[PDB]
């Protein structure tokens, strides 16, 4: 637990169809010695284990809807959801695996209400 990952906002109450944005700020830059920035976003649906959504800052994982996109500079990264669907409910986490030990953000709760 060294590189702090802070997410904004911690609670994201939204409504179907609306857009959603989650920010993640790292306390240090996160570029691996090999030049890659291993910044991933995970979604943990209720009653499930986390699942990978975005890796390498902006690459969508297999089967991930196009509504999910990622961006980010040196210490500030963003996960955006064009249109929020009922199946998007859950907790989102950013994660850096660029420097040891790998660290996760504290989680952002997306709740539709």
């Amino acid at each position: 637990m060294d590189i702090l990952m802070t997410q904004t906002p911690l609670y994201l109450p939204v409504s179907l169809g609306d857009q959603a944005s989650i920010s993640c700020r790292s306390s240090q830059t996160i570029v691996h010695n090999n030049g890659n920035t291993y910044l991933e976003w995970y979604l943990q649906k209720p009653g499930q284990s986390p699942q990978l959504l975005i890796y390498k800052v902006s690459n969508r994982f297999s089967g991930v809807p196009d509504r999910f996109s990622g961006s980010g500079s040196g210490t500030d990264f963003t996960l955006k959801i064009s249109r929020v669907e009922a199946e998007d409910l859950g907790i989102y986490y950013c994660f850096q695996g660029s420097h040891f030990p790998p660290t996760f953000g504290g989680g952002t709760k997306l709740e539709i209400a």
């Binding site: 637990m1 499930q48 284990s49 390498k56 994982f61 695996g97 660029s98 040891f100 996760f104």
Partner: protein, 120 residues
């Protein structure tokens, strides 16, 4: 279709020991390291460490080296996480996780998690 199956929830008394298992299927167990993550009440995720499945050597993150121990049963493609001298602070759901290319850079596959509850 990688599958990581973990053992059931545990309700333990303080000071006792708990041993969690993670059964891997559909891939060569010894080709990928097994990582372990601790999810504390509230949802925070903390990296515990990883075990090299080919050499059976563990590497832990911040203070976990103390009472946590990783082990393997390569013949049954199973990884274990044992917690000795259970403390209230250990209450959490533990996950075994496998990465994409065995570099611990991208956690792709996760077990369903094992909730450990330390009572009174």
């Amino acid at each position: 279709e990688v599958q990581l199956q973990q053992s059931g929830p545990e309700l333990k008394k303080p000071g006792e020991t708990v041993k969690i298992s993670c059964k891997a299927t559909n891939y060569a167990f010894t080709d990928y390291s097994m990582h372990w993550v601790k999810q504390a009440p509230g949802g925070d995720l903390k990296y515990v460490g990883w075990i090299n499945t080919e050499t059976d050597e563990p590497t832990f993150a911040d203070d976990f080296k103390g009472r946590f121990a990783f082990s393997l049963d390569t013949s049954t493609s199973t990884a274990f996480l044992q917690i000795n001298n259970l403390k209230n602070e250990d209450t959490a759901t533990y996950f075994c996780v496998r990465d994409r290319h065995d570099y611990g850079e991208i956690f792709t596959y996760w077990g369903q998690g094992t909730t450990v509850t330390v009572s009174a």
